[PDB]
Design a protein around this ligand. Structure first.
Ligand code: HEM
Ligand SMILES: CC(=O)/C=C/C=C(\C)CCC=C(C)C
Length: 414
């Protein structure tokens, strides 16, 4: 029946998700301490209001986030993974195997998983380094005071993504813009008065146009790339339908662009806010970039929320989650868990171990592009230190929303 008192702490209002991350942490802190698994009403003023939705369970502790992520046989992804209620047509055209359970998730992920192994990322790491060098070079020619997001943070992800999938150059900047749009539906500075559902469809429609054109191109002459193997594979005795192919292209475009782009912006600001941490990394880069990248991901946590649906009754945090109830993981709360980290509010690029859940709590849906993301962050931050040793981030403009911890724009000086 899902009938129980709602928690006192507000995790659903628009104003809560339009406030600073520090303000939200004071709410996450009390929950982590007193009621780590709490019941809340659905996200207010959602893209679609669902009378079938009684609420959700808030999972704030890192250990519990790992428990939900790894126990996928109980906490399913096949009934949706987004925190806010989103119209089904928009979900069906974007989620792909992210919102899928085995065995179908195992089938589809296997078709593209070969291009993300550490071996294959090492094979293409030089091209990422070459793109990072030219991007920082072009940023230097732009001069100080320019927007770091548009002139750097968004450039390396789309170049790395498009090089793997084979996106035509004329479509590269529009795909990056369309991918960023699909997580900015709560940003008035992005909508600019437009109703969000129409903006989401328009950008989804364009990405499906690029997907249909690339799928038809690769079915004629297949290549060694990621999209070639997907559109030419035989799944259950037949090639994948156009809807499945386009949905994965959206998933790949959004996850491959938005997450790394925000981590780069958050990383430059973190290096500016902690100069002694930047000097520590610079003093021995090749030996220390590994743990530094892991903490920059922990510091950014670009994916703030992902949800699951309980397949059966499950006891978590002293609370009996019922079958069919929504369970939301708050990765920013888990990465500030005092039960897991020593002073998580301070940037420590030497943090070891770093059991952060920036790539999720681990398990079946663990981030497909984790090795690729790490290679991008190592390359772009090494080039920013090679070419622009005095670079500093300005005032960031944070994007309101309950899904991605995003910076709309941020000037930089050097
Ligand atoms: C750089 C290129 C990236 C690509 C191509 C990529 C792609 C993907 C894909 C395809 C999935 C779905 C995997 C599945 O459902 O089995 C996924 C999951 C995920 N990704 Fe990534 N991603 C990238 C970077 C990142 C970064 C930098 C972060 C965070 C710092 C991130 C956070 C996540 C999270 C939280 C999940 C869900 C994990 C879970 O549900 O357990 N991604 N990614
Ligand atoms: C409105 C809309 O289309 C939402 C699309 C959301 C995704 C394609 C999920 C992206 C996956 C990540 C960021 C790990």
């Amino acid at each position: 029946a899902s009938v129980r008192p709602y928690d006192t702490i507000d995790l659903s209002s628009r104003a809560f998700w339009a406030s600073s991350a520090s303000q939200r942490e004071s709410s996450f802190s009390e929950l982590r301490a007193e009621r780590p698994v709490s019941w809340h009403p659905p996200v207010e003023d959602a893209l679609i209001q669902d009378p079938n939705d009684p609420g959700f369970w808030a999972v704030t502790r890192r250990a519990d986030i790992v428990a939900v992520s790894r126990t996928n046989e109980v906490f399913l992804s096949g009934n949706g993974v987004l925190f806010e209620n989103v119209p089904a047509e928009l979900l069906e055209a974007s989620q792909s195997f992210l919102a899928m359970d085995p065995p179908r998730h195992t089938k589809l992920r296997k078709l593209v998983s070969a291009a993300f192994t550490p071996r294959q990322v090492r094979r293409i790491e030089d091209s990422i380094k070459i793109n990072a060098k030219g991007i920082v070079d072009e940023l230097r020619m732009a001069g100080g005071g320019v927007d770091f997001v548009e002139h750097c943070a968004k450039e390396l992800p789309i170049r790395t993504l498009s090089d793997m999938v084979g996106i035509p150059e004329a479509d590269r900047e529009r795909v990056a813009h369309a991918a960023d749009a699909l997580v900015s539906w709560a940003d008035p500075r992005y909508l600019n008065g437009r109703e969000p559902l129409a903006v989401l469809f328009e950008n989804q429609m364009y990405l499906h146009q690029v997907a249909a054109s690339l799928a038809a191109e690769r079915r004629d002459r297949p290549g060694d790339d990621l999209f070639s193997a997907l559109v030419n594979a035989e799944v259950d005795g037949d090639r994948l339908a156009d809807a499945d192919v386009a949905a994965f292209f959206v998933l790949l475009a959004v996850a491959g662009n938005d997450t790394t782009r925000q981590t780069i912006s958050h990383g430059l600001k973190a290096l500016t806010d902690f100069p002694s941490q930047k000097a520590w990394l610079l003093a021995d880069f090749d030996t220390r970039i590994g743990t530094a990248v892991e903490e920059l991901v922990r510091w950014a946590t670009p994916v703030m929320t992902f949800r699951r649906t309980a397949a059966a009754d499950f006891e978590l945090g002293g609370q009996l989650i019922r079958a069919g109830e929504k369970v939301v993981m708050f990765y920013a709360s888990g990465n500030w868990d005092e039960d897991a980290f020593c002073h998580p509010e301070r940037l420590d690029l030497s943090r070891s171990p770093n059991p952060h859940v920036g790539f999720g709590g681990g398990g079946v849906h663990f981030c497909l592009g984790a090795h690729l993301a790490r290679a991008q962050l190592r390359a772009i931050f090494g080039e920013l230190l090679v070419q622009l040793p005095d670079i500093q981030a300005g005032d960031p403009v944070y994007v309101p929303g309950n899904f991605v911890h995003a910076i709309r724009s941020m000037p930089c000086t050097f």
